[PDB]
Amino acid sequence: FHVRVTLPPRKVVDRWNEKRAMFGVYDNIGILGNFEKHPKELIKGPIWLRGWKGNELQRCIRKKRMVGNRMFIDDLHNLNKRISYLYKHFNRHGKYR
Amino acid sequence: GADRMSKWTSKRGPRTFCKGRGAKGTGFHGRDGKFVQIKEMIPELVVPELAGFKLKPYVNYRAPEGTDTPLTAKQLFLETAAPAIEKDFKAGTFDPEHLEKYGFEPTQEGKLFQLYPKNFPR
Amino acid sequence: SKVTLPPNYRYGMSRPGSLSDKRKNPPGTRRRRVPVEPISDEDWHLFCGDKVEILEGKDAGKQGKVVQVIRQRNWVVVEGLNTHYRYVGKTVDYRGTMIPSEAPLLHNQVKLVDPTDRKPTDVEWRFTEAGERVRVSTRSGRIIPKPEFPRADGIVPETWIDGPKDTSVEDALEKTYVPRLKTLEEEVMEAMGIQETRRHKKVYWY
Amino acid sequence: GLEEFFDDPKNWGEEKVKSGASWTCQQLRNKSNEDLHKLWYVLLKERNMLLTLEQEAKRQRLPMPSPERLEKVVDSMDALDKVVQEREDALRLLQTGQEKARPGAWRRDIFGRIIWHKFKQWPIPWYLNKKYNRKRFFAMPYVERFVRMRIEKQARIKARKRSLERKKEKFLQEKFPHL
Amino acid sequence: ARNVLYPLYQLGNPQLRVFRTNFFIQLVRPGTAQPEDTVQFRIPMEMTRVDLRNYLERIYNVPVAAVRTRVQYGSNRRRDHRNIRIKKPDYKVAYVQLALGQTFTFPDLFPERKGASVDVDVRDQVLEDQRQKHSPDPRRGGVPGWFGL
Amino acid sequence: SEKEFVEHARKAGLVIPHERLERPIHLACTAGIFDAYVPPEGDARISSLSK
Amino acid sequence: YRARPPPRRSQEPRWPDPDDPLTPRWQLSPRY
Amino acid sequence: NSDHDRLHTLVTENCFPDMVWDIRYKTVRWSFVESLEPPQVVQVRCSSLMNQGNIYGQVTVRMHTRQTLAIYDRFGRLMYGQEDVPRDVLEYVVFEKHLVDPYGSWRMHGKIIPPWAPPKQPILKTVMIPGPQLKPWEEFEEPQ
RNA sequence: ACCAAAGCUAGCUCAACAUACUAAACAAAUACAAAAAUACACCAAAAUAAAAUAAAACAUUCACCUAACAUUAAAGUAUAGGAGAUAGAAAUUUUUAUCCUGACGCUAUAGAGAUAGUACCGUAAGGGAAAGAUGAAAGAAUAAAAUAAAAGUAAAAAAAAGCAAA
Numbered sequence A: 001f002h003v004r005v006t007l008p009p010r011k012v013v014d015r016w017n018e019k020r021a022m023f024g025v026y027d028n029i030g031i032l033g034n035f036e037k038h039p040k041e042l043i044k045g046p047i048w049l050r051g052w053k054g055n056e057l058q059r060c061i062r063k064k065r066m067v068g069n070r071m072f073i074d075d076l077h078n079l080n081k082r083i084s085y086l087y088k089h090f091n092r093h094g095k096y097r
Numbered sequence B: 001g002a003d004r005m006s007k008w009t010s011k012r013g014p015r016t017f018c019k020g021r022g023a024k025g026t027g028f029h030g031r032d033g034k035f036v037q038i039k040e041m042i043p044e045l046v047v048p049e050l051a052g053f054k055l056k057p058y059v060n061y062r063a064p065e066g067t068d069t070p071l072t073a074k075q076l077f078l079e080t081a082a083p084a085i086e087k088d089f090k091a092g093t094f095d096p097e098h099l100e101k102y103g104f105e106p107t108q109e110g111k112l113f114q115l116y117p118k119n120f121p122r
Numbered sequence C: 001s002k003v004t005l006p007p008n009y010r011y012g013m014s015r016p017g018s019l020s021d022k023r024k025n026p027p028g029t030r031r032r033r034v035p036v037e038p039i040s041d042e043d044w045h046l047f048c049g050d051k052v053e054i055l056e057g058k059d060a061g062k063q064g065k066v067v068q069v070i071r072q073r074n075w076v077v078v079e080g081l082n083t084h085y086r087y088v089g090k091t092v093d094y095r096g097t098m099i100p101s102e103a104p105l106l107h108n109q110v111k112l113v114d115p116t117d118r119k120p121t122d123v124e125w126r127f128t129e130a131g132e133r134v135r136v137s138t139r140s141g142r143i144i145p146k147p148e149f150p151r152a153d154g155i156v157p158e159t160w161i162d163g164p165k166d167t168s169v170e171d172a173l174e175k176t177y178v179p180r181l182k183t184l185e186e187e188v189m190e191a192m193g194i195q196e197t198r199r200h201k202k203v204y205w206y
Numbered sequence D: 001g002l003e004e005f006f007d008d009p010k011n012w013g014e015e016k017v018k019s020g021a022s023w024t025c026q027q028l029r030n031k032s033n034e035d036l037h038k039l040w041y042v043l044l045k046e047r048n049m050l051l052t053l054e055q056e057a058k059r060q061r062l063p064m065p066s067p068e069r070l071e072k073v074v075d076s077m078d079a080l081d082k083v084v085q086e087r088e089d090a091l092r093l094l095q096t097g098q099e100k101a102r103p104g105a106w107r108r109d110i111f112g113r114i115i116w117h118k119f120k121q122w123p124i125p126w127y128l129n130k131k132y133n134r135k136r137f138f139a140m141p142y143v144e145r146f147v148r149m150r151i152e153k154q155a156r157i158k159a160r161k162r163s164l165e166r167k168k169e170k171f172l173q174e175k176f177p178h179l
Numbered sequence E: 001a002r003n004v005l006y007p008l009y010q011l012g013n014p015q016l017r018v019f020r021t022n023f024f025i026q027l028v029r030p031g032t033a034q035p036e037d038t039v040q041f042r043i044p045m046e047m048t049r050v051d052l053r054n055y056l057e058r059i060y061n062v063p064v065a066a067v068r069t070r071v072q073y074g075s076n077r078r079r080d081h082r083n084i085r086i087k088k089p090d091y092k093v094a095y096v097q098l099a100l101g102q103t104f105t106f107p108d109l110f111p112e113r114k115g116a117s118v119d120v121d122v123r124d125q126v127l128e129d130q131r132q133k134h135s136p137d138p139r140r141g142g143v144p145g146w147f148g149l
Numbered sequence F: 001s002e003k004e005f006v007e008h009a010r011k012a013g014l015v016i017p018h019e020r021l022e023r024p025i026h027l028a029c030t031a032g033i034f035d036a037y038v039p040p041e042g043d044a045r046i047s048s049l050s051k
Numbered sequence G: 001y002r003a004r005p006p007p008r009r010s011q012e013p014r015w016p017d018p019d020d021p022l023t024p025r026w027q028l029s030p031r032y
Numbered sequence H: 001n002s003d004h005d006r007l008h009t010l011v012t013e014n015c016f017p018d019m020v021w022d023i024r025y026k027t028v029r030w031s032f033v034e035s036l037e038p039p040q041v042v043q044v045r046c047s048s049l050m051n052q053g054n055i056y057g058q059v060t061v062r063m064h065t066r067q068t069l070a071i072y073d074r075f076g077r078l079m080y081g082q083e084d085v086p087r088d089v090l091e092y093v094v095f096e097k098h099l100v101d102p103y104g105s106w107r108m109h110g111k112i113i114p115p116w117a118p119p120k121q122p123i124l125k126t127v128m129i130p131g132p133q134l135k136p137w138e139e140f141e142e143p144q
Numbered sequence I: 001a002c003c004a005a006a007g008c009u010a011g012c013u014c015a016a017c018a019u020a021c022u023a024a025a026c027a028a029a030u031a032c033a034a035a036a037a038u039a040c041a042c043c044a045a046a047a048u049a050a051a052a053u054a055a056a057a058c059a060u061u062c063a064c065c066u067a068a069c070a071u072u073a074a075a076g077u078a079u080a081g082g083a084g085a086u087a088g089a090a091a092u093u094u095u096u097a098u099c100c101u102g103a104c105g106c107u108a109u110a111g112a113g114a115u116a117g118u119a120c121c122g123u124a125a126g127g128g129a130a131a132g133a134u135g136a137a138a139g140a141a142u143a144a145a146a147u148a149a150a151a152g153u154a155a156a157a158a159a160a161a162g163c164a165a166a
């Protein structure tokens, strides 16, 4: 439980940088823009997670279906094993049934 | 157990394991079991005469160097054949079919020191 | 020959293969990495042998001559300006020769000074119309000559005497190459008169 | 002439022995092949003498007098060898057009890699060679999987190296806000 | 030469000639009492007895009579700081017996200088005198001698 | 089972590291007083009178 | 600061390269 | 006052050790009270070394003056002498300056004491001077 | 007071883009008992995935399980199933070009096993680690400052009687 004996360097974080000032600026692009673009298109990230949300099993299933043809050998094997384990646990284990 | 990182030399085996250390062979085995050495297989050092040679292993420190201009095939051709080709073309006797008189070797199988097969060590 | 260094290597104004550096950092050490500002060879304007001024430190405003530069840590050192005093002659029952050694300084703390007004200036690289790249000051607008410095060997070409195993300049610069289409082997054989009639047989390569 | 392995007897006990600078490529190229051939042995004798001196210094547990002479001689011999190799390469390019002085081929061994198999010199053709015939230059169908693992491993190494370099650049920019 | 491809020899082939040899040898002082006519060399591992005989007879013009070679194995017991064995390279040792009755004795390549010994003795005496004069006076009992009074 | 101690403080400088310094030592003084003054034997009885 | 240009959906027709092997087939079908 | 930086500025590298080495772990109370005879320059000497092209000039000054020196121990007890005694001392202070150096501060370099100078004041404590330590195979020799 | 304790870095992780994918070294030697220059050959081979598990047993069955078609729906629908557990489409529809890419991921028992597939352990296939911390300068070790905070000891062995406390 030994704790450090010196003051850590105080992080000089500013609230008025470019990212913090323009955070989510076009969140209402559709509503205020005569609908052409959903707020889905502003999400940057993995291809299988743009404008989508699910639990671990659904996320693994979607990843395997979408980008499973470009995964490495061990990555695909790990994804398959994780899918199998999640299927078994979710469909056969738990309390509330 | 035995080692695996160590080199597998001739000192690490039985009597029947007699591996060479990298020296080139110099003959064959004769009739009664002896080794017959071939004179032509032994290298002959072509050592020049250094008695009257006026150069030393080190250069003068104040001697200037030169800009690095590695010799290329284009420069070698310009130095050895371009003047002859130009003079012959001006004279009008140039023969494109025959180029052996200019140092060109159509086939390397004839001469002693071949270039592509590299018949000479050094 | 060159020495190899681990990526986690700290430079301490000592030769990497020197005994002092070896005793300071054994081969089994890997210290914390210090942040070094990336400055390229085309933007490093601090050379060895030029006069510079000191910005911050105990000797604020003093000028000195650069004696060494270390590009790995962006260090520049001047002779006898930023000094701490250390004893070099240490024995069991005797001490002495307390000499002032000098600490290294950064490029942000050392800036070049032009020889005209002897005042601090900012150096920017410019391309001259003559095909040369010479440092040009911006505060005044003048070029700074390259600070020629003697090499570490310790010999100057102006005073050199040839030994028994040195070639003369004329012999070294004499050109005797005749660019023909013969190999060194063929030329040596012809020169020494070695006659070989028989030729090699057919040799298969695979 | 067995004394040629040693320096002059008047320089034996001297602490420092001075010598000239090393030979350079331009100076070597300026010379003819006769002078190059002679200078090779001129440097060979000096290199043997310097090696003898270094070994004797190690044996006697004393520093070698000015050991830069061996480095200078090695550099000069390397420059001479480079010059001769350049001349031979230029001549063989002019005469045959082959870039490499030894025959070779881009083969694919049983491990799936692409290698540059150099050719050895034999007295019999390839189809009659006991030792050469049992070699295998091709990959079996079970090697594609390992080739894919090699590709993926190299890709992972390169990707994490790129990420490391990007993180280092960002950290340096944050640490030195000179913009 | 070494690290080069020797041309294949077949019946009637030309004699193999090497123009610029790649072999570098060292002359070493024997660690064991050898006869007067024996000279000890450390030679590259690719050199043979005939190669060394030609090397000595042609480059140096030495009338050699016999050559006997052996391979000395370098120790591989010393461990690095990573517990990895460090191997000293193996080397070939050759003994050359001269022919015409010439006797070779390895010279003293580091003769001690009387002037150098005298200078070293003078420096040692000066250092001892400096240490003696810097030694504190026992009668002072640790009180510094720099102050006047 | 084979861990060892470290940090054996030793000072051993040789002529090669003592002469292989790239930059030289920039002294600010000298070893001693060259041409050391020898005061005259009589000073105690001459310090009494100013002139 | 000044905000980046708004994301706008281009009204001009889009035609993927038929020679690209990586383009999806639904963008090359006649229904597209 | 134990001001090492200003002491380095004032005295030179040949004067700092001889005055700090054996005093770092003691307490000194040095005061200046009077100077009967003003310091007088005795001689000036110059040494030029052509290896580096550097010239050093030292000036010797004879000084007869009065201080009050009291050197204390690390435990706070008196060691050398009382604080109110104004003893007279005659010394020869030799200063050195590097003329080639653009800055060139005048720094104290050496302190010459005459061989015939009276012995310094005795210390307060007693001192034991042991004889030569003898191995069993050595017999003591009495000097006469 | 010893033993000790605290650094912030090495580097890792997850995605996007991407040239389009077995890196650099390959002088000589390397499938003779690998790193041994050199002799009349022989070379090549395919034939289903199984089971652990679920059906509370276990026999028919048991999604993913190293084979491309992605997304919004039709739809968990039609169907297939000891018609049980469970499995499960299709016809037909939607998907506007590029930058805006970094981190409400870890900081040396964490993050890759990794300082390294190295020491070491096995005949072999194979398994597989721990270990870094001063400072602008150690070319400032008669070296300078912060904690003297875990368990274990010493400073300082114990005096009838008892879950050690109230």
Ligand SMILES: [Mg+2]
Pocket: B001, B002, B003, B004
């Ligand atoms: Mg083993």
Ligand SMILES: [Mg+2]
Pocket: B010, B011, B012, B013, B014, B015, B016, B017, B018
């Ligand atoms: Mg054996």
Ligand SMILES: [Mg+2]
Pocket: B013, B014, B015
């Ligand atoms: Mg045996």
Ligand SMILES: [Mg+2]
Pocket: B034, B035, B036, B037
């Ligand atoms: Mg024989």
Ligand SMILES: [Mg+2]
Pocket: E069, E070
């Ligand atoms: Mg033998």
Ligand SMILES: [Mg+2]
Pocket: I054
């Ligand atoms: Mg069951």
Ligand SMILES: [Mg+2]
Pocket: I056
């Ligand atoms: Mg159950």
Ligand SMILES: [Mg+2]
Pocket: none
């Ligand atoms: Mg059962």
Ligand SMILES: [Mg+2]
Pocket: none
């Ligand atoms: Mg059961």
Ligand SMILES: [Mg+2]
Pocket: none
């Ligand atoms: Mg199954």
Ligand SMILES: [Mg+2]
Pocket: none
């Ligand atoms: Mg049925």
Ligand SMILES: [Mg+2]
Pocket: I084
């Ligand atoms: Mg049932």
Ligand SMILES: [Mg+2]
Pocket: none
């Ligand atoms: Mg770890």
Ligand SMILES: [Mg+2]
Pocket: none
């Ligand atoms: Mg405790």
Ligand SMILES: [Mg+2]
Pocket: I161
């Ligand atoms: Mg009780």
